[PDB]
Amino acid sequence: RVLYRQMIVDLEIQSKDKSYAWFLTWMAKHPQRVSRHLSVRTNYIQHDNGSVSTKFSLVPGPGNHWIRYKGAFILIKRERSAKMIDIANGSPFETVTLTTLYRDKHLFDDILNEAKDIALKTTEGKTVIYTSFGPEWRKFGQPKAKRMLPSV
Amino acid sequence: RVLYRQMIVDLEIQSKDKSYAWFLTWMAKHPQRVSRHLSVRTNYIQHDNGSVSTKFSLVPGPGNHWIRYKGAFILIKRERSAKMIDIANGSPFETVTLTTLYRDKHLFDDILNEAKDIALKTTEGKTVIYTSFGPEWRKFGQPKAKRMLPSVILDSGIKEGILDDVYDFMKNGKWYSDRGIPYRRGYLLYGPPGSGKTSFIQALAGELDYNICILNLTDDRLNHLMNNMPERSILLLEDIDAATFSGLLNALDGVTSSEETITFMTTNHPEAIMRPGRIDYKVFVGNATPYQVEKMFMKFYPGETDICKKFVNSVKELDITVSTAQLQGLFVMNKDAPHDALKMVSSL
Amino acid sequence: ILDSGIKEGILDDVYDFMKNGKWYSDRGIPYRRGYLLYGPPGSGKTSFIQALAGELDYNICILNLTDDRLNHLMNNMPERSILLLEDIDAATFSGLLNALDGVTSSEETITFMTTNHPEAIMRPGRI
Ligand SMILES: Nc1ncnc2c1ncn2[C@@H]1O[C@H](COP(=O)(O)OP(=O)(O)O)[C@@H](O)[C@H]1O
Ligand SMILES: Nc1ncnc2c1ncn2[C@@H]1O[C@H](COP(=O)(O)OP(=O)(O)O)[C@@H](O)[C@H]1O
């Protein structure tokens, strides 16, 4: 056991961190892996009307999987706690554990960077335009969209 | 144990997800299964009165069942936690686990899609109509119902010439963004009064489940009204031929949002605005056609083809301003009786 | 207690009108219906309407006979209600017909009407 823990690294991403959903989203879209388990995640928006916009997507889910990032054979576990309950999302406390050799520790940042990009590609800002209303600045013209510099 | 976990998949739907009730509802209505266990689910609404509307329905419930979807023999367990308590619904934490072979993993999405449809069939939207109250939009006329596009009957090609132009305009976000032009579009339904324009706009908004922020024709607040529109809306401008004109064009060019901004315009007689970016799709919905009269007659009375022709050649004579509102009026007063309509509508 | 056939001629017309949602939706006509109980004063009309509302456990939004707010009153009715118009023979008439044609809701909209002497409104969609 000590020799095995002496040639590997770990990386725990716990369910509180913002980099938990990002990483599962990334690992869903990875081409080469073997993930026997799956978990549904369904977003579901009810507007002012009874109208519903809903969408479901599968993710790795509890139990361990494997992945091959750049010739690494990373082993990932995902675990749920049988006793503790988070109050931020109303779900039990979860934990993802990545594990590769020590030699490829430098891969982890790369992975997380990729995840951040796949996270940042979807979330898009909107350039709010404030304006003068007497001696105080008020918002005006509910958020515009980015004008995408090649366009000008 | 490792070989067995080596030829199967799992799918955990946990009790927090919205796709938990949907799936149990779906599996209740599946024809071929063997579910020894059952659980009651009782909805119970007490109104302002002591009156009660209550309804109970059985679902799979705890313990494992079986099902056969498309020749798969899926095994499903449902479990409750003896220690944890959810605070959203006040119940212990539950979990559904589907398990089939790896080869039929692609079935899961299908199942969930079916569940979503059985979920989406019951929940029905209602096209709220906002309106102008000074320089601010207030709700008006507590939610209507969807008008169900087959119900409105207009000319042969106009029902598809707009339902596909709009469906294209909902897919050209990148095209409008990369060119550096605003992402908006106008429409000009024109014709005689009482031809079914507003009815068609409401039917289309019900198709796209948006909300009609109706506005009929002050110039300083018109710009404020254009700029401040709620989420998921479809602007409607009745009678644009009643007008400040330069301010109208200025505010009409200065309409923006964070998403699509469709702005239909209806007028009774359309005689600079027709430039693209402003009004760019003009189509003429007018009086009744021998196709419209046939389709209305078949809309009211399903089947009974023989009478249909016998009406059309009758309405070919004595017709001046025959409009579809008039046909709706003269067909609703003689409901469930086409033979009375044959002699009643022909004389008006 | 009223005449021999009238207790069933209305308790089955209403029970049909509660089952024709698809029929009224597919035709593209609004899903409403009026009624005209007429007779001499003191015959038991209002009592029958209250008994029927108790049968369907709805709520009687009674209104007895201003034209600009009448439309607002017609439009804004609570959930699970049954409109009642006492003495429609006391009237603005064009505004009455306009607001009466412009009554809407998210569900059924029954509107009984009682009058002591009923002498255009009788067209279907209206009474
Ligand atoms: N093609 C149609 N199908 C169904 N109802 C129609 C049709 N054309 C007109 N109507 C009816 O005519 C009435 C008034 O027409 P409306 O659409 O309000 O007129 P406009 O749009 O010209 O102002 C409504 O009750 C509407 O349902
Ligand atoms: N068949 C009946 N059953 C019960 N009460 C009745 C009946 N007929 C008349 N009444 C009595 O008539 C009275 C007045 O009825 P009301 O509804 O005010 O009459 P109207 O609708 O003609 O104005 C009530 O006190 C009611 O109990």
Swiss-Prot record, chain A:
The chain holds residues 77 to 228 of 456 of the full protein. Present with 1990 molecules/cell in log phase SD medium. Signal peptide: none annotated. Belongs to the AAA ATPase family. BCS1 subfamily. It is found in: Mitochondrion inner membrane. Chaperone necessary for the incorporation of Rieske iron-sulfur protein RIP1 into the mitochondrial respiratory chain complex III. This is Mitochondrial chaperone BCS1. It comes from Saccharomyces cerevisiae (strain ATCC 204508 / S288c) (Baker's yeast).
